[PDB]
Amino acid sequence: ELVMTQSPDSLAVSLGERATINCKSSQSVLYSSNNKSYLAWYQQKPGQPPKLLIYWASTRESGVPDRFSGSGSGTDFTLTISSLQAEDVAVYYCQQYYSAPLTFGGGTKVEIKRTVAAPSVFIFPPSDEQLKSGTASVVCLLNNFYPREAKVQWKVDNALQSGNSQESVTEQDSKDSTYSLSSTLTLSKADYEKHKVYACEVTHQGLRSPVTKSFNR
């Protein structure tokens, strides 16, 4: 079974700069006669099927912008995107279609390198609809920041919380290259009413110092 090994696992490149990804197969995929290498590259964007970019190592699919190009032969290949665009952020997969079973590399994640950007912070108290059923979710939103890493800390009545929250981060935005983050504090209606001041404290390299959004109830 051919094993496809991509490198690096992850790559971050400034807009318009050059992104190169590597594919190394355990055996040669160069077919004597036709002398073609049976290797392809695919692009996968969050929540979509892979899209074909390159076949036979170096031929662009119909409609694929010429900034995309593949090189190599036999065992070593590279995909290069000469000038990276915001919308080129995706996971890139090489695949050998030389011998069965057909196999894929583990994928390389291509992100953009932007300048640091501060998050907009919003807080949402629980709905009446949800309180009517004994649960209280408080949602904190960090909108359009960079880099990805941000620290969200909930303080109920100044009491630093833990074990009662989940967060989630979007994939890099395909226009402004930022991230957004959603953190949810969950309490039983009971615990929610035994306190007044709900607070979200955000820490992030775009902020001169931690920022706090809160409310009372």
């Binding site: 392809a40 099927p49 949402f124 709905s127 609809e129 979710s137 909108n143 949810t184």
Partner: protein
Amino acid sequence: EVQLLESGGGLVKPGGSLRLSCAASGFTLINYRMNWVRQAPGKGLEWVSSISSSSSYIHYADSVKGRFTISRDNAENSLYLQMNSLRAEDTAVYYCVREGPRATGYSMADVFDIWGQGTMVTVSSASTKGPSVFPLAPSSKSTSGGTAALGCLVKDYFPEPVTVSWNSGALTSGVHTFPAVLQSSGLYSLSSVVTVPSSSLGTQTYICNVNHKPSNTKVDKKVEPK
């Protein structure tokens, strides 16, 4: 115009079975070798099975052998995967895919050049649970400068996926729908937010459309200001 419309999938118990199907439009199945490829939540791509035009040459990945039957109906321009004796490890998104035109019967292969939207398959002992959809009301505390944030909390559902649209597809700009997170209950929760002009809050109606196929939950929550 040239595409593969997939149906089937969903929740199934271990040991249970499920049938996927794919309909091609914009081209004729007869000419191409057809495959199924799967991708498990968070991981890479795994070829599952292939079927030559005449059904004379059929192959399966090792992990699947004995349990999966691929079949093809050129007249109906359709492709099928019958999955039996399903296991936790078969949980994934399944895509039907067309192999490029240089692929014939038992020849050298071609590239996977056309992919369906994919169908999620979840093999689990747990019964399905539909989400509760709660509003995230825009307020002075979800407002910055001229723009306000509103959204929906889609809470406690199983399994994935849940789809969220805003105003029946009309509203797409500013929309951030977050990846589900697993709670302690072992259920999923997910939230979708949009940012819109504060000015419009009083006049523009904002609705999120939540669909959870597995539990037959179609919810349309209207989100109200202050």
